Design a protein around this ligand. Structure first.
Ligand code: M6A
Ligand code: CL
Length: 498
């Protein structure tokens, strides 16, 4: 029954706020008025982005922001709620630019969560901003707290939660209670910063919106799909950093949960969350990108997949060679490395030399430009069928995407997601999910259902024997074992009784 969340980022830069207008797309390419009533019904959340944490360690707009124009923009978004009583306008604190390890505001994030009093002041500023501008909830997109910061971050979220709950009571908003989300890591290297404390991070949240995209990029040496649903054995694999997380698990426990190397996929990130105890599937939201990543200097043979390449990683783009043929938005933005889905349709449709190819293991499309040696990894309405099917099958909370301004003009990507979850006449019972590589890790949070003969005292069990005892199915790690399962280190808990 429960409606899947559909969570769309709305991003607008400070200069566009300060010059806001709905009638000149050279000033504001994606005004609020582009979010029509029909789009509004298809969304459950819009994440307005981005606010920041200032040096006073409070949530704040960019100080260069014209406040009356900011209100007017936010008012336009909340007016959308008139077409859809389920819809929320969240706001988002952070983003890569403000909050990455080398970001301009980074130290503010670290300091805002550092002490009890700092957290109280920060938490209060969050709810005060929410109430003053008319937002429906708080999203945190710190990319990413690390190590020593994680306990502070967790405490900050717990405190925001309580303050949100007070506010919900004060405004009688039990029908649409104020909510708390974060944008979570969607790959294991960044996820490993807070993985051991994942249950604590998720507990105060309504959702954790996994950034299961940007899993490939110019910083990797080999081209790859940025959001492969499942793995391709011909593609690159990666060290599983999670096996070095401070978990206190045994060798066998670590090995069964964290195969290494592994395929960096959407399914991997999702399963890595489900493996942890106290992380419920309904709180897990799959991120998807409404943009492609482009690579140049690729050699042929497999459509530009898994190729070396010559794409600069530096920021800003180091020159004016805008080599993404047909991408007009790339010229406007002076960077050929990322193109909106909206632009990609146009590139494919014009005579620009791209073929649209399909990897049936990853269930994702890609563009290949054979003449110039270009490769583009992106998602479309077809890749979203498989992802939506996976969302229903794994009982996830829904879908998130970055970002709304990158859909095509008729918003076909958002309409597709809405249809795959909610349309009466859409049927995916026969959609084939393929033979791509699944992440097979098992941990305490996702033990499969199993049967086996009851454990018998006095019996000598060989290596690999399976018994049932006190709620679970257990496996001997070596032989010959006669101890009761769970009473020493010889037995591995591998499954649970119906
Ligand atoms: C959370 C995020 C991603 O931030 C984007 C920026 C940071 C954008 O990052 C992405 O779009 N990344 C895709 C993955 N998404 C995320 N990391 N996070 C995310 O989805 N959060 C929900 C990168 C590719 C970018 O365009 O950076 C340019 C220079 C390369 C940068 C940093 O100058 C910049 O340039 C513009 C295009 C003018 O945007 C601004 C920012 C100054 C804004 C502030 C950043 C933004 C929104 O474009
Ligand atoms: Cl609700």
């Amino acid at each position: 029954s429960t409606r899947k969340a559909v969570i769309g980022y709305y991003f607008i830069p400070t200069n566009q706020i300060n010059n806001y207008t709905e009638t000149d797309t050279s000033v504001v390419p994606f005004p609020v008025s582009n979010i029509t009533p029909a789009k509004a019904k298809q969304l459950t959340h819009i994440n307005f982005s981005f606010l920041d944490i200032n040096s006073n360690l409070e949530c704040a707009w960019d100080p260069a922001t014209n406040d009356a124009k900011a209100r007017d923009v936010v008012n336009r978004l909340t007016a959308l709620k008139a077409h859809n009583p389920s819809l929320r306008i969240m706001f988002s604190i952070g983003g890569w630019y403000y909050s990455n390890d080398l970001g301009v505001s980074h130290a503010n994030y670290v300091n805002a969560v550092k002490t009890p009093a700092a957290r109280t002041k920060f938490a209060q500023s969050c709810v005060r901003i929410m109430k003053d501008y008319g937002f429906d909830g708080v999203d945190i997109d710190w990319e990413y707290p690390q190590a020593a910061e994680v306990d502070g971050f967790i405490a900050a979220l717990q405190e925001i939660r309580t303050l949100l709950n007070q506010q919900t009571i004060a405004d009688g908003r039990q029908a649409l209670p104020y909510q708390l989300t974060i944008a979570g890591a969607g790959g294991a290297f960044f996820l490993s910063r807070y993985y051991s404390k994942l249950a604590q991070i998720v507990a105060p949240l309504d959702y954790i919106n996994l950034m299961t995209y940007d899993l490939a990029g110019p910083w990797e040496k080999i081209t790859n799909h940025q959001a492969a649903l499942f793995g391709d054995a011909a593609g690159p694999t990666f060290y599983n950093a999670l096996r070095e997380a401070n978990l206190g698990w045994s060798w066998e426990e670590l090995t069964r949960a964290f195969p290494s190397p592994f395929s960096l996929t959407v399914d991997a990130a999702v399963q890595q969350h489900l493996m942890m105890e106290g992380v419920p599937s309904a709180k897990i939201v799959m991120g998807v990108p409404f943009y492609g990543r482009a690579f140049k200097g690729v050699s042929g043979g497999n459509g530009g997949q898994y190729s070396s390449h010559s794409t600069p990683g530096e920021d800003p783009y180091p020159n004016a060679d805008y080599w993404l043929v047909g991408c007009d938005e790339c010229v406007r933005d002076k960077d050929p490395r990322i193109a909106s889905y909206r632009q990609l349709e146009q590139m494919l449709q014009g005579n620009y030399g791209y073929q649209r190819l399909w990897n049936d293991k990853t269930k994702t499309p890609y563009l290949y430009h054979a003449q110039n040696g270009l490769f583009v990894t992106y998602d479309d309405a077809e890749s979203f069928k498989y992802k939506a099917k996976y969302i229903k099958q794994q009982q996830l909370g829904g879908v998130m995407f970055w970002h709304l301004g990158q859909d095509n003009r008729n918003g076909d990507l958002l309409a597709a997601l809405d249809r795959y979850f909610n349309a009466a006449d859409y049927d995916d019972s026969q959609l084939d999910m393929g033979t791509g590589l699944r992440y097979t890790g098992v941990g305490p949070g996702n033990l499969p259902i199993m049967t086996a003969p009851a454990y018998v005292p006095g019996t000598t069990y060989a290596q690999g024997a399976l018994v049932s005892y006190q709620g679970y199915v257990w496996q001997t790690k070596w032989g010959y074992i006669t101890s009761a399962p769970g009473s020493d280190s010889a037995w591995l808990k591998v499954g649970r009784l119906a």
